Structure 1
Amino acid sequence: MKEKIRKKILLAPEEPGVYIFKNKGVPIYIGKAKRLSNRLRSYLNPQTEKVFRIGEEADELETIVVMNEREAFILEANLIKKYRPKYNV
């Protein structure tokens, strides 16, 4: 995983949000979190091959802090529908 992405993960706040792993400007995975810090840190110790792939292929991680878990739910759904990222089912 790129060092800048590891740094971004380790700095992420304990706040609800949506995250977007990207490569060459294109989203490759979009997810949401009750706490960005907790969810993103899980990518450092990959529990599945898919989590490993997302974290290796990405050249960028964007995070969006949201107002609450309701906003995380709808924003994540909207962005997955918009971008249909390769690793989202």
Structure 2
Amino acid sequence: MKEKIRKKILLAPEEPGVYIFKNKGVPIYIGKAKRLSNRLRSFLNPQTEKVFRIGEEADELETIVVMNEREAFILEANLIKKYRPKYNVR
């Protein structure tokens, strides 16, 4: 994993949000979290081959802090429909 992505993961807040891994400007995986810190730190010790691939292929990580868990649910669904990222199921 790129050093800049590891740093961004370790700085993420204990707040609800949506996250987007990208390569060359294109989303490759979109997810949501009750706490961005907890879900993003799980990418550091990969429990599945899919989690390993997402963290190695990415050259960028974007995070979006939201108002609450209801906003996280609908924003994540809308962005998956818009971008159809390679590692999200269809």
Q: Would you call these one fold, judging by a TM-score over 0.5?
A: yes
2 CA distance for matches of 1:68 and 1:45? 27
Q: Percent identity?
A: 99
1 CA distance for matches of 2:73 and 2:16? 10
2 CA distance for matches of 1:45 and 1:83? 27
Q: Please give the per-residue CA displacement for 1:7-29, whole angstroms capped at 9, x wherever unaligned.
A: 00000000000000000000000
CA-atom RMSD in angstroms: 0.3
Structure 2 match to 1:6: 6
In structure 2, stretches of 5+ residues that fail to align are none
1 CA distance for matches of 2:2 and 2:57? 9
TM-score, length-scaled by structure 1 = 0.99
TM-score, length-scaled by structure 2 = 0.98
Q: Please give the per-residue CA displacement for 1:15-73, whole angstroms capped at 9, x wherever unaligned.
A: 00000000000000000000000000000000000000000000000000000000000
- Secondary structure of 1:30's counterpart equals strand
2 CA distance for matches of 1:31 and 1:64? 11
In structure 1, stretches of 5+ residues that fail to align are none
The reply to whether residue 63 of structure 1 matches residue 63 of structure 2 is yes
2 CA distance for matches of 1:57 and 1:69? 28
After the TM superposition, which parts of structure 1 deviate over 4 Å for at least 4 consecutive aligned residues?
Answer: none
